[PDB]
Amino acid sequence: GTGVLTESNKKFLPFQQFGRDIDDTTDAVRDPQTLEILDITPCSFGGVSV
Amino acid sequence: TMSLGAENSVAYSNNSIAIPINFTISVTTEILPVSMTKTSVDCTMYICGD
Numbered sequence A: 001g002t003g004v005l006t007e008s009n010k011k012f013l014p015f016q017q018f019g020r021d022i023d024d025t026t027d028a029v030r031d032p033q034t035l036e037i038l039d040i041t042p043c044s045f046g047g048v049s050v
Numbered sequence B: 001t002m003s004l005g006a007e008n009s010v011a012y013s014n015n016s017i018a019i020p021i022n023f024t025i026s027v028t029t030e031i032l033p034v035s036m037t038k039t040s041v042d043c044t045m046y047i048c049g050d
């Protein structure tokens, strides 16, 4: 994926590896080396108007 | 089978009139939609993305 990774308050169960939004969209992950949960938020985008 | 309403023979005759002796001031609420959420979607990032 591609995003702004950040620390999070989410508590996955011991077997869970990814977290999903209502719209399927993956919104958190567990780091496989140190077992912290990271939020994923999208890199900033939008129209440019003159 | 549904009932359309209570039946009523209006008390008509060629020299009878009903006049109201009294009134009620009624307040009625009408709701009307005026706008949508102003969504806009990037076609390249939706279809392809990165």
Ligand SMILES: *[C@@H]1O[C@H](CO)[C@@H](O[C@@H]2O[C@H](CO)[C@@H](O)[C@H](O)[C@H]2NC(C)=O)[C@H](O)[C@H]1NC(C)=O
Pocket (backbone or CB within 6 Å): A032, A033, A034
């Ligand atoms: C993967 O390896 C790392 C590195 O050994 C483990 O993290 C800790 O690393 C520190 C040193 O920086 C040690 O003092 C700790 O004993 C390590 N373990 C813990 C539990 O803190 C990491 O745990 C390993 N991950 C897995 C899933 O095996």
